[PDB]
UniProtKB/Swiss-Prot annotation, chains A, B, C, D, E, F:
Induction: enriched in cerebrospinal fluid of multiple sclerosis patients (at protein level). Widely expressed. This is Tubulin polymerization-promoting protein. Belongs to the TPPP family. It comes from Homo sapiens (Human).
């Protein structure tokens, strides 16, 4: 709940990422899904 | 709930990202979905 | 709820992003969706 | 030297092609080059 | 030297192709080169 | 020198191809080269 990230960093919570230089997604139904109740 | 990110950083909460230099998405049904109740 | 991001940063909450230099999206049904109840 | 191609065809000589439905080229120096002497 | 290709065909000579539905080229120096003397 | 290819075919001579549905090329120096003398 207190995130402190200095030069050139990366942090997350509950995150979903596809980090990276050359990214390619093809021929997909769904990429990100969430549900609650 | 208190995020402190100095020069050249990245932080998130509940985030969903596709970070990156050359990004390509093709032939997709859905890319981001959320539901609550 | 208190986000403090100095020079050249990125932060978010509940965010959904497609950050990146060369971005291309093609032949898609939906890109961003949300629902509540 | 005599090419006869009926409905819905493709033919070539000395050809260089990038045929196709969804085409994407990115971050390239050269795509087509020829030299003679 | 006499090519006869009926409906829905493909033929070539000396050809160089990248046929196909979803085509992606990225981060390349050269894609097609020829030299003679 | 006489190529006869009916519906839904493929033929070539001296050809160089990358046929196929989902094609991806990445981080390449050269893809096609020829030399003569």
């Amino acid at each position: 709940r207190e995130m402190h990230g200095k030069n050139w960093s990366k942090l997350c919570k509950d995150c979903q990422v596809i980090d990276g230089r050359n990214v390619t997604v093809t021929d997909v139904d769904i990429v990100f899904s969430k549900i609650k109740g």
